[PDB]
């Protein structure tokens, strides 16, 4: 290619969007923003394919141009805005606040929250940069550059920012025993406590995380997000609660509930 | 001893022309648990492509080979051996790849047949992308 790509094929779309094959050749290519290509989920897929509020992309464009959708404290008028992890989408007329948390599977979940919960969110920082006059800076996962932070906030920590002012309230330090949302890979959607940290020079470090039901698993730290201290989270959790029980137990919980409902 | 080229050979980091009333040698730790040699600190040689006293960093892979050629200056040719598996004939085969690795002059007791440890870095020349990190001497040959 002689430059950057602007289209995205429906086959080349990532699997967690769960777009269907027969309707179109192209997939909605997300615009550039605070999240990566295969980590976010676009507003047109979140509005049309998941909530089923709109039928077509023209209807999605009409919804985003009536100034109704409010993503994390600011109206975005683009249908392909990258809405990634821990993003809060607010709709005023229906009174619906949504927090983009992964489900127990790889997909995102339609997660309803209160406005008191939607007022804040949680973000993992990536690096601490020293600015031009000795000013500390946090670089979060959603590219939020917050300056003059708490010096106890380190490289692998999370911060509880406020949407109305863009400042930090509290923070979770990456320690053993804390909870762990796994943001990427084969264990995408798991929730459990951190039981071990294995450092590696050169090669990347790994973390052993123990589930609440005892399912211990290793995961590299690049796809790891803490959500609170101990076993007490600071957010609301969807159903399933990040366990990934076996496929036989999923078949049992489907079939027994179906025969009980009748 | 040193400085046999046209320009003044010097370390670009340290300044050595300060007001007086031994040159201060620059060195660094390389990482990955590799110990720096005593001669890289003690001696008066310089080398800009040395992984201890030069402007090069070790990143990524840390490999090992055996030394087979020492005819090039400030660099050696090593030989790596491995057994490749063909899935049809459930066997192995000997294939070798001889890469050119920059030999820092801190390692002086270097003979042929020595199991050497190399490390990936930036390309210093057309075929050299590796520095020498530690040199294990061959079996026997204590004399």
């Amino acid at each position: 290619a002689r430059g950057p790509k602007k289209h995205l094929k429906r086959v080349a779309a990532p699997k967690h969007w769960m777009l269907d094959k027969l309707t179109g050749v192209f997939a909605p290519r997300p615009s550039t923003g605070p999240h990566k290509l295969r980590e976010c989920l676009p507003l047109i897929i979140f509005l049309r394919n998941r909530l089923k509020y709109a039928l077509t992309g023209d209807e999605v464009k009409k919804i985003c141009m009536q100034r109704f959708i409010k993503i994390d404290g600011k109206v975005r008028t683009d249908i392909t805005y990258p809405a990634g992890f821990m993003d809060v989408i607010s709709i005023d007329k229906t009174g619906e606040n949504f927090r983009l948390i992964y489900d127990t599977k790889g997909r995102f979940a339609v997660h309803r929250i209160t406005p008191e919960e939607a007022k804040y969110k949680l973000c993992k920082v990536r690096k601490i940069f020293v600015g031009t006059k000795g000013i500390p800076h946090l670089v979060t996962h959603d590219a939020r550059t917050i300056r003059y932070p708490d010096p106890l906030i380190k490289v692998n920590d999370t911060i509880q920012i406020d949407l109305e002012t863009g400042k930090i309230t509290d923070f979770i330090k990456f320690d053993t025993g804390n909870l762990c949302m796994v943001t990427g890979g084969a264990n995408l959607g798991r929730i459990g406590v951190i039981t071990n940290r294995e450092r590696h020079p050169g090669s990347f470090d790994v973390v052993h995380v123990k589930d609440a039901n005892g399912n211990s698993f290793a995961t590299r730290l690049s796809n790891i997000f803490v959500i609170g201290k101990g076993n007490k989270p600071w957010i609301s959790l969807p159903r399933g609660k990040g366990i990934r029980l076996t496929i036989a137990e999923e078949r049992d919980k489907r079939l027994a509930a179906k025969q009980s409902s009748g | 001893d040193i400085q046999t080229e046209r320009a003044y050979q010097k370390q670009p980091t340290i300044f050595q022309n300060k007001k007086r009333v031994k040159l201060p040698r620059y060195y660094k730790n390389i990482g990955l648990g590799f110990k720096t040699p005593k001669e890289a600190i003690e001696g008066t040689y310089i080398d800009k492509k040395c992984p201890f006293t030069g402007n090069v960093s070790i990143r990524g892979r840390i490999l090992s080979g055996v030394v087979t050629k020492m005819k090039m200056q400030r660099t050696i040719v090593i030989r790596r051996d491995y057994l490749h598996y063909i899935r049809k004939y459930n066997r192995f085969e000997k294939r070798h790849k001889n890469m050119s690795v920059h030999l820092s002059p801190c390692f002086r007791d270097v003979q042929i047949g020595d199991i050497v440890t190399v490390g990936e870095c930036r390309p210093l020349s057309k075929t050299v992308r590796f520095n020498v990190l530690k040199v294990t001497k061959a079996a026997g040959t204590k004399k």
């Binding site: - | 080229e5 046209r6 320009a7 003044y8 010097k10 300044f15 050595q16 022309n17 300060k18 007001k19």
Partner: protein
């Protein structure tokens, strides 16, 4: 144009690489600047990423640093004496990085006379008729004469540097890349550096 590429030449084993693509815009080289000594002529060139590079073509002044005291001055370059890469760059006066140039000693002389209040250069017999350097050397207060006397304790200068100040020309090594940024900055040679380059100049002269 003149391409910088690894595919146009042979392998490690000695075989020829066969072209699978033509010359690209990122595999690009440009003709050399080869800046001279004269009135300033700097041309801007757009490069990759929408940035600018300043091709010098004639250049006379440079911000040269005297490292023993940490005092740089803008000083005119008058001659190029030594170059380790090519002696043709000595014959045709061309400024590249790591050139040895001769520069005027007057700003460093004025700084030394202003700071340490001692004569510098100054072959014995001459006196200044506009008297301004004599005014700058004399007329001290009682408590600040102590400060200049404490400065005088650390005012020892090297013999070769003192002979170069007496001749009027200092040897400076070019440290900045002149065809890239447009400046011809660098540092005045001292000590073993100065002895090595004066030995190479004497070996070239014979």
């Amino acid at each position: 144009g003149i391409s910088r590429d690894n595919w146009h030449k042979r392998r490690k084993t000695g075989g020829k690489r066969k072209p699978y693509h033509k010359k690209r815009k990122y595999e690009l080289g440009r003709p050399a600047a080869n800046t001279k000594i004269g009135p300033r002529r700097i041309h801007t060139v757009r490069v990759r990423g929408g940035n600018k590079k300043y091709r010098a073509l004639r250049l006379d002044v440079g911000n040269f640093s005297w490292g023993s005291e940490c005092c740089t001055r803008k000083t005119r370059i008058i001659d190029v004496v030594y170059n380790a890469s090519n002696n043709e760059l000595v014959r045709t006066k061309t400024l590249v990085k790591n050139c040895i140039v001769l520069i005027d000693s007057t700003p460093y002389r004025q700084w030394y006379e202003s700071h340490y209040a001692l004569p510098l250069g100054r072959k014995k017999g001459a006196k200044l008729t506009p008297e301004e350097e004599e005014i700058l050397n004399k007329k001290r207060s009682k408590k600040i004469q102590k400060k200049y006397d404490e400065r005088k304790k650390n005012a020892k200068i090297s013999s070769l540097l003192e002979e170069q100040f007496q001749q009027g020309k200092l040897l400076a090594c070019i440290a900045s890349r002149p065809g890239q940024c447009g400046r011809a900055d660098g540092y005045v040679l001292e000590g073993k550096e100065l002895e090595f380059y004066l030995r190479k100049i004497k070996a070239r002269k014979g």
